[PDB]
């Protein structure tokens, strides 16, 4: 019994008005429209949700019928817009996962706007799908999902993998894997610009030199030098302690062998370096200086209960540690070292074997326990490529399984005023009670030095080729570092002076004070070192490497191939010209090292390569050795200094770093480009304040974002 249309053709006037693209002079055009169709003895109507036949041994499609029409080819067509299953979106195989007991509901689909035209013969059966308001009463929810076969509470959009709802103010920020503070700083500067006073209250990083940098630039931030998983265990145990405690002169007591009167409790931790799991308090002993403070397990403190009550009552008032709900935003850039294509020792078959990669899971475990209003997570583009993006999709799947609105974007650092490329992945999450923030469009042009993976090309934050406006010209190396005075290979001065005025627009911006940046970390009045040239120090190469870069010529594109003893051959493979015996330095080791000739089949121009003023550095990285990269200063006999690298990363000059030189390089190399975080910070603040507009995923930053 063949499939046919039921009823009278839709009145011509109303048919053309509702579906105008089907009439008039390769979209399928219609001869007439219908309101109903019968397929396999079942009557279907406009608006019905149906199962639709798909490929062999593939899950049936789910669609909302929007048109019943006979084409101009005498065939019977219907149009539906597709519902996405969780696994139909970009999550794919990561629908299997679990985050704090949350899993993906099999009955939860996502209404898209993707349409298609198919013959009536594809319709399998009807299906009752209900629309659940995410902000409904949970009781009214249950009775509504009780009624349904499937349900949806959000839409899905291929562009930027958006899951989203249908149809001075202060805010607290927690920086997981905070580093020296690049991402958390930018967010609050951009927030402040939008009118939101976002404050980094908590920062967790197990590198002490990074915490020393972030604490110095943000004195009010409670920055904890500890692993993220220990921070998580501490948060759980903190809630229990808070629950327990909340609302003349002492006589001496005898003390046993190792019993001492306490003065106050000055710290709290869970486990740690030399300790095992459990709560420890930093005890200050009466009559003893802070140097004699020690960490003690809580079971050793049963004889000082009021000191614990005082510490918890007191710390809960200042929120030294967040309880669930205290945290408005959670940002974090978990390690990329197990993911990035630089690492020739990754294992694509077990992408979570690396403890670095597991921190992605621990990030979302902390999100799951605190339920912040907004989640911002950054990592590298390989997170969508390594192990077929396993860890990228794991992160997105965790957010939506927790019923967060989510979006995925790829942002190019140079596009916001940097002589970098540095494309990074940014994952937005937002509760159903909040507005999902957008991605800010590029304000500058760049020299393109990398592309997005084909599976995620629709998450690239950029203008369409057909609609690009004139942006600011691309920033080059000279625009960032021509400001700075000359320094040598050995340069140990933490703090020196500028040897001149800023020459360029970027240099005038990067030199702005804290007040001018809207950096309120020191509140009223400037903080320290505004006016000083901080950390303008290169990696102090050894004697061999120094004399090696001393011999690299001051040319554009000069590298190790310019040293005496090496010449080019066929197919640009480096060799020795036997005319010259192998040159040795004063050390007796070769002028050119063997690995430089062995690097990438002897085809690389990177070893001991020199940068030039009209070039860009594609990625500022944590390592500064000139062995396998182009990092030699254009005119001087050294590599780029920490401060030069930080400028390429967008750090304001006042942002002082601490630790050894190698550690300072790691801090700027791991950072989120501060202008990138400042742009996202504006979109976060505009969304937080309910002052955003429309469903569009992309946002043109206001002229005010690029100052005078």
């Amino acid at each position: 019994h063949e499939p046919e249309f039921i009823g009278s053709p839709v009145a011509a006037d109303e048919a053309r008005s509702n579906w105008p693209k089907r009439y008039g002079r390769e979209e399928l055009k219609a001869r007439c429209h219908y309101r109903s169709a019968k397929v396999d003895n079942v009557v279907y109507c406009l608006g019905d949700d149906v199962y639709v036949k798909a490929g062999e041994n593939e899950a049936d499609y789910i669609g909302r019928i929007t048109e019943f029409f006979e084409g101009t080819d005498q065939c019977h067509y219907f149009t539906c817009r597709w519902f996405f299953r969780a696994e139909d979106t970009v999550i794919n195989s990561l629908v299997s996962i679990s985050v704090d007991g949350h899993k993906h509901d099999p009955r939860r689909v996502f209404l898209s706007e993707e349409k298609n035209d198919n013959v009536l013969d594809c319709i399998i059966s009807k299906v009752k799908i209900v629309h659940v308001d995410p902000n409904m009463d949970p009781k009214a929810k249950a009775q509504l999902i009780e009624s349904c076969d499937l349900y949806y509470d959000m839409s899905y959009s291929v562009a930027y993998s958006t899951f989203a709802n249908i149809s001075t103010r202060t805010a607290t920020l927690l920086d997981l894997y905070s580093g020296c503070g690049g991402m958390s700083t930018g967010l609050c500067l951009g927030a402040a610009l939008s009118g939101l006073k976002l404050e980094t209250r908590w920062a967790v990083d197990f590198n002490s030199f990074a915490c020393q940098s972030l604490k110095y630039n943000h004195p009010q931030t409670e920055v904890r030098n500890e692993k993220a998983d220990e921070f998580l265990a501490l948060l759980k145990e903190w809630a229990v302690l808070c629950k327990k405690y909340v609302q003349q002169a002492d006589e001496d007591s005898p003390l046993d062998k190792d019993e001492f009167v306490v003065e106050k409790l000055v710290g709290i931790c869970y486990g740690g370096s030399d300790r095992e799991n459990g709560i420890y308090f930093k005890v200050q002993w009466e009559g003893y200086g802070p140097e004699e403070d020690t960490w003690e397990p809580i079971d050793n403190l049963s004889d000082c209960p009021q000191k614990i009550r005082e510490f918890v009552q007191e710390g809960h008032k200042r929120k030294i540690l967040p309880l669930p709900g205290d945290v408005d935003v959670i940002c974090g850039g978990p390690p990329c070292q197990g993911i990035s294509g630089f690492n020739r020792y990754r294992n694509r078959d077990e992408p979570l074997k690396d403890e670095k990669n597991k921190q992605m899971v621990t990030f979302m475990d902390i999100v799951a326990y605190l339920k912040p209003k907004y989640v911002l997570m950054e990592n590298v583009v390989d997170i969508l490529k390594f192990a077929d993006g396993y860890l990228g999709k794991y992160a997105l799947s965790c957010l939506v399984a927790m019923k967060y609105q989510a979006r995925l974007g790829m942002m190019v650092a140079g596009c916001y005023g940097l002589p970098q490329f540095r494309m990074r992945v940014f994952l937005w999450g937002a509760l159903s009670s909040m507005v999902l923030p957008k991605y800010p469009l590029p304000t500058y042009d760049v020299v393109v030095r990398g592309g997005a993976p084909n599976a995620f090309s629709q998450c690239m934050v950029a203008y369409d080729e057909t609609q690009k406006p004139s942006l600011k010209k691309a920033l080059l190396l000279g625009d960032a570092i021509s400001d700075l005075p000359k320094v040598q290979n050995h340069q140990p001065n933490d703090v020196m002076e500028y040897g001149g005025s800023p020459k360029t627009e970027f240099q005038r911006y990067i030199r702005l004070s804290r007040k001018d940046m809207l950096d309120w970390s020191f509140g009223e009045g400037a903080g320290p070192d505004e006016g000083k040239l901080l950390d303008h120090q290169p990696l102090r190469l050894n004697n061999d490497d120094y004399e090696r870069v001393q011999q690299i010529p001051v040319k554009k594109g000069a590298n190790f191939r310019d040293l005496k003893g090496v010449r080019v051959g066929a197919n640009n493979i480096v060799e020795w010209d036997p005319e010259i015996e192998r040159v040795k330095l004063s050390s007796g080791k070769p002028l050119v090292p063997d690995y430089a000739m062995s690097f990438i089949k002897g085809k690389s121009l990177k070893p001991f390569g020199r940068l030039w003023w009209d070039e860009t550095v594609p990625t500022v990285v944590t390592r500064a050795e000139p062995h396998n990269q182009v990092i030699i200063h254009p005119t001087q006999a050294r590599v780029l200094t920490i401060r030069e690298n930080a400028r390429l990363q967008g750090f304001p000059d006042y942002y002082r770093l601490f630790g050894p030189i190698k550690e300072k390089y790691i801090q700027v190399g791991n950072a989120v480009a501060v202008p990138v975080a400042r742009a996202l910070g504006y979109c976060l603040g505009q969304a937080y304040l309910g002052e955003s507009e429309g469903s569009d995923p992309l946002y043109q930053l206001p002229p005010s974002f690029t100052s005078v």
């Binding site: 597709w82 035209d117 198919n118 013969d121 594809c122 399998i124 760049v446 090309s457």
Partner: peptide
């Protein structure tokens, strides 16, 4: 016979560079 399988279905290029 068997129920015919239904069709389920390029994006504009994004321009980061100045000219193209």
């Amino acid at each position: 016979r068997t129920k015919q399988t239904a069709r389920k279905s390029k994006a504009p290029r994004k321009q980061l560079a100045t000219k193209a």
